[PDB]
Design a protein around this motif. Structure first.
Motif, PDB file in Angstrom:
ATOM      1  N   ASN B  20      55.769  63.401  25.755  1.00  0.00           N
ATOM      2  CA  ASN B  20      54.486  63.623  26.373  1.00  0.00           C
ATOM      3  C   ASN B  20      54.674  64.829  27.422  1.00  0.00           C
ATOM      4  OD1 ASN B  20      52.353  63.268  28.355  1.00  0.00           O
ATOM      5  ND2 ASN B  20      52.610  61.147  28.665  1.00  0.00           N
ATOM      6  N   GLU B  22      52.742  66.021  29.477  1.00  0.00           N
ATOM      7  CA  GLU B  22      52.166  65.871  30.617  1.00  0.00           C
ATOM      8  C   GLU B  22      53.185  65.777  31.901  1.00  0.00           C
ATOM      9  OE1 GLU B  22      49.034  63.188  30.958  1.00  0.00           O
ATOM     10  OE2 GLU B  22      47.714  64.434  29.479  1.00  0.00           O
ATOM     11  N   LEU B  23      54.177  65.273  31.437  1.00  0.00           N
ATOM     12  CA  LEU B  23      55.308  64.922  32.437  1.00  0.00           C
ATOM     13  C   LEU B  23      55.598  66.134  33.060  1.00  0.00           C
ATOM     14  CD1 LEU B  23      57.402  62.343  30.688  1.00  0.00           C
ATOM     15  CD2 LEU B  23      55.281  61.884  31.999  1.00  0.00           C
ATOM     16  N   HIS B  24      56.355  65.906  34.323  1.00  0.00           N
ATOM     17  CA  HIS B  24      57.004  67.158  34.869  1.00  0.00           C
ATOM     18  C   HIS B  24      58.096  67.612  34.455  1.00  0.00           C
ATOM     19  CE1 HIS B  24      56.806  69.880  38.395  1.00  0.00           C
ATOM     20  NE2 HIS B  24      58.118  69.167  39.133  1.00  0.00           N
ATOM     21  N   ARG B  79      51.014  64.742  39.902  1.00  0.00           N
ATOM     22  CA  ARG B  79      51.769  64.983  38.741  1.00  0.00           C
ATOM     23  C   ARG B  79      52.515  63.657  38.207  1.00  0.00           C
ATOM     24  NH1 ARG B  79      56.312  68.141  42.385  1.00  0.00           N
ATOM     25  NH2 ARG B  79      58.182  66.433  42.069  1.00  0.00           N
ATOM     26  N   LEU B  80      52.769  63.639  37.081  1.00  0.00           N
ATOM     27  CA  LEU B  80      53.421  62.632  36.143  1.00  0.00           C
ATOM     28  C   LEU B  80      54.837  62.811  36.228  1.00  0.00           C
ATOM     29  CD1 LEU B  80      51.505  59.895  35.542  1.00  0.00           C
ATOM     30  CD2 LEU B  80      50.271  62.275  35.857  1.00  0.00           C
ATOM     31  N   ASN B  89      55.867  55.280  33.075  1.00  0.00           N
ATOM     32  CA  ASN B  89      55.945  56.640  33.906  1.00  0.00           C
ATOM     33  C   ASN B  89      55.281  56.381  35.221  1.00  0.00           C
ATOM     34  OD1 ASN B  89      57.222  57.955  31.783  1.00  0.00           O
ATOM     35  ND2 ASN B  89      55.184  58.329  30.946  1.00  0.00           N
ATOM     36  N   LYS B 110      45.476  61.026  35.175  1.00  0.00           N
ATOM     37  CA  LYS B 110      45.867  62.591  35.024  1.00  0.00           C
ATOM     38  C   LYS B 110      46.136  63.068  36.402  1.00  0.00           C
ATOM     39  CE  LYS B 110      41.918  63.521  33.421  1.00  0.00           C
ATOM     40  NZ  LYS B 110      40.822  64.132  32.798  1.00  0.00           N
ATOM     41  N   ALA B 111      46.453  64.570  36.367  1.00  0.00           N
ATOM     42  CA  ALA B 111      46.634  65.310  37.705  1.00  0.00           C
ATOM     43  C   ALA B 111      45.227  65.553  37.992  1.00  0.00           C
ATOM     44  CB  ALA B 111      47.438  66.355  37.486  1.00  0.00           C
TER      45      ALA B 111
END
Lengths: 46, 271
Positions: B20, B22-24, B79-80, B89, B110-111
């Motif tokens: 993923n 999108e994760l930080h 953030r995720l 998550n 989402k962010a």
RNA sequence: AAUUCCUUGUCGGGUAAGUUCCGACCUGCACGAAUGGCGUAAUGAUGGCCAGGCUGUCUCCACCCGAGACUCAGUGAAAUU
RNA sequence: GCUCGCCGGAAGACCAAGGGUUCCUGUCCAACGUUAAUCGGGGCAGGGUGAGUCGACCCCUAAGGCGAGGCCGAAAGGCGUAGUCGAUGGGAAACAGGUUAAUAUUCCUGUACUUGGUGUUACUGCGAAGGGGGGACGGAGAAGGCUAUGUUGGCCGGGCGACGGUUGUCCCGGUUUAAGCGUGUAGGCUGGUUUUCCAGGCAAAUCCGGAAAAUCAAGGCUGAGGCGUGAUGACGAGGCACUACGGUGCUGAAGCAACAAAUGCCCUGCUUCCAGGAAAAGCCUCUAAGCAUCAGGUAACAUCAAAUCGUACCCCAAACCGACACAGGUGGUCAGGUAGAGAAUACCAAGGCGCUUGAGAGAACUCGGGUGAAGGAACUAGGCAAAAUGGUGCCGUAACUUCGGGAGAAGGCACGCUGAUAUGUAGGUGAGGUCCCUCGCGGAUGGAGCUGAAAUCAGUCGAAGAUACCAGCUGGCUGCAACUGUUUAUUAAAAACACAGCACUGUGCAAACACGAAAGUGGACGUAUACGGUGUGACGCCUGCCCGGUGCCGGAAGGUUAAUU
RNA sequence: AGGACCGAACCGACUAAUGUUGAAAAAUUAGCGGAUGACUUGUGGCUGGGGGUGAAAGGCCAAUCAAACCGGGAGAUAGCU
């Protein structure tokens, strides 16, 4: 070959020392027996 | 995203990763971290109470807000983040007053998305309200079993519950296990499903992958010298007795629920 | 057959000659489908078999270099009885 | 003392742990030393361990231990809160040289640094058992820039050769210098600055965080190494006087450059991945309660203090664990030269050793090795053992396959030295000089000098050029297990145990379950995409018929049925 | 990138010989396996005997394990030597 006795003064005193024996009812009885028997060295302290 | 690695070596043929982006890709929020020492499945007496636990990667605990009692204050998602202490998550949200907290990440969060908790909140994923104000037939997660103590149901990767009815001070729910349970109409719940659904499609691929998770090998019992296990031994592979746990319980159909204290909220236990 | 007692089963292959090995036949003494069945590339200080190369493994041992054995000096045990 | 031989990623050097005077000197040889012994880690006596900066103590905590009250438990006692202990971790500071028979970053010389106390002076909002920041952290990989260090040249000094030659492109040796202070570079991170406002940080807050504007882009932090100073010094090969040949005073020339280069430093960095990577204090800030011509706080100068314990010696070993002066075991640090991919290997340096019985002889037999006519597995349970293969580069490489592999498949050719291409090439390094410039450890140009492969052609020696050490035998059929792994310490390493995957089943959270007379703890600071148990055991094609028996899950009309009455 | 490959340190222990009153109450020599990982290792800590731990052999728990060691019941009992 690696033998059984790997010395360490810290572990020796923490396991068989005076304050370790004096911290439990059964440890204090160990000292009472050795005093009654007349042991010159009660523990492994020094 | 689900992706299948290539068989460049035995140990990578069957491994299937969940990626993923999108994760930080950085460090987590420190003020919400805590020490989490491992136990090895041992209790205060130093005895193994739960087998197959030991080792694994070091982990820090993320303080998650399961209560969501900041009512009347919108929060935006920053953030995720990846959490090793759970399957789902988490999301770092920022409130208008400047307070930051961690929450479970719903399906399509989402962010930049705004959230809110309380009875005056909107009906959208991520928001939290008492089930009394939640329309029947809706899907929620992180459900409270007693008002004020925090969510305890539907907290895993892709889990969710469904509100089926509301009789009085209570409401009825069907849990992801198929059980039909009822709880008070004052317990808070969060709209939507926990989003990591593809977490189940993961394939470890090798033994070491389980040791990273802190899982120690499971020795069956059939080849264990009856002094150690009822299934015990025998010359060859005999196993001529009813399947049984250690300590002597069936483990192949025998029910072991003996609470009798609640016995009121269960209606359609399962199957 | 890691399972076949009768049994070195029968035919074939490989060898001058093969109770082992490989491939078929089925009369499965007493295979069999998650106490899993049949296949399976790769892997294995794994079991079995066949070749090339290699050789003192052998026909059949010979010589040589060193440490002991043997002699001198010093020290000086043991099981057993 | 002259030779010889051995180790040299140790058989050298420095430590921890552990031991506890084995250290040095003198003296003795009964016993101890597997022999002798004038010797010794032996006997006797004496001597020897010098710290504000090393370490411990100390401040701070981890796992964990103890645990005021407290909960629980026949008694003993168990668990645990507040707290208090607990390093294997975090936290201030010293370097070089010289010196003793034996100690030294501890003594001496020289040059420095740190934390506190007191006092003086000047300027002042100070204050926590609280808030925030920071401390503060993973694996792998990639280079780049540096140093330790090494090589060569130059310089200085000395040397002219036991046998042909050696005044030259010859030979030997040396060419060393710290912390600290200053400079703040290669390079890395981050946009700064001012003003206003706020449901947050258990109360407050000028601090943190957040929102909205204005204003500038240059601002700052971190940072190896280098340069300078430290250093008109010290050290210094060798000399000059003493010189019991045991050593002491004096003097002491050169003391530069280039190249190569780390596993060490910049780097707690950069990139990237999933298994998502300690805590607390010191330290920097924020204010509250409170105190304000005080007390306290900042800076400068001065002064005082920095205690106590350890410091000898061995430490891959004769001093530790092994009953031995025992082919064993034992964690960390330092890491030279030639060849080499290399911490392999061979030979060497510094340095350290020849292993505490020797002398002869040169039978059988045993042990450890070398060679072998012809044959080449005929040996044997079995090619056990041995022999053999062995390197780099290029060509080339099958069935099968999960398309990654198989594969270094198999197999074949070429490898030395000399010269030329090229008085040492491609490449790397980069001076002086020129030019620019925010004139700086700057940039561009520039190419000296240094270093230096690989390849081709020709020629040449030997039986043999991957010549030594070093260094895959290969292929074909097949059983079992998927694989990497694990296991009977001390006769079994396997087809056994694990394994990813699959399935059944239990479990709605004060979960099931487990350790516990209990409290409680683990499970889990998890919540059915989770957890426990059981069986099977990658993957692929599949997993059939039977619920009478046993067990499990349900059910109810009836029968039978305990205490009790 | 890799429970990837070759191979020292390091961790292991497949084969053979030696040794078997051994140098050693399990080692030596020549080969062998793994060697970025389910790896290895130092210091300290926790789990105590019908209990612990165990990738499971009835393995290990101080050269002792189908129920450790020490002391006590205890001069157990022994129709057997």
């Amino acid at each position: 070959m690696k033998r059984t006795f790997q010395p360490s003064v810290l572990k020796r005193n923490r396991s068989h020392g005076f304050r370790a024996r004096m911290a439990t009812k059964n440890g204090r009885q160990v000292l009472a027996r050795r005093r009654a028997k007349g042991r010159a060295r009660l523990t492994v302290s020094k | 995203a689900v992706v299948k690695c290539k068989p460049t070596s035995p140990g990578r043929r069957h491994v299937v990763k969940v990626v993923n982006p999108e994760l930080h890709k950085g460090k987590p929020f420190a003020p919400l971290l805590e020490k989490n020492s491992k136990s090895g499945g041992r209790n205060n007496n130093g005895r193994i109470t739960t087998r197959h636990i030991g080792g694994g990667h070091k982990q820090a605990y993320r303080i998650v807000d399961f209560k969501r009692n900041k009512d009347g204050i919108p929060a935006v998602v920053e953030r995720l983040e990846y959490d090793p202490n759970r399957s789902a998550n988490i999301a770092l949200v920022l409130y208008k007053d400047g307070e930051r907290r961690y929450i479970l990440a719903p399906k399509g969060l989402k962010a930049g998305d705004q959230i809110q908790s309380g009875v005056d909140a909107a009906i959208k994923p991520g928001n939290t309200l008492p089930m009394r104000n939640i329309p029947v037939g809706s899907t929620v997660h992180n459900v409270e079993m007693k008002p004020g103590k925090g969510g305890q149901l539907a907290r895993s990767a892709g889990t969710y519950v469904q509100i089926v009815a509301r009789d009085g001070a209570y409401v009825t729910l069907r849990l992801r296990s198929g059980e039909m349970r009822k709880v008070e109409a004052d317990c808070r719940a969060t709209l939507g499903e926990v989003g990591n659904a593809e977490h189940m499609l993961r394939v470890l691929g090798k033994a070491g992958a389980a040791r990273w998770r802190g899982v120690r090998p499971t020795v069956r019992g059939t080849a264990m010298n009856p002094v150690d296990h009822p299934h015990g031994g025998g010359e060859g592979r005999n196993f001529g007795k009813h399947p049984v746990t250690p300590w002597g319980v069936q483990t192949k159909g025998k029910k072991t629920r003996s609470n009798k204290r609640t016995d009121k909220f269960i209606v359609r236990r399962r199957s």
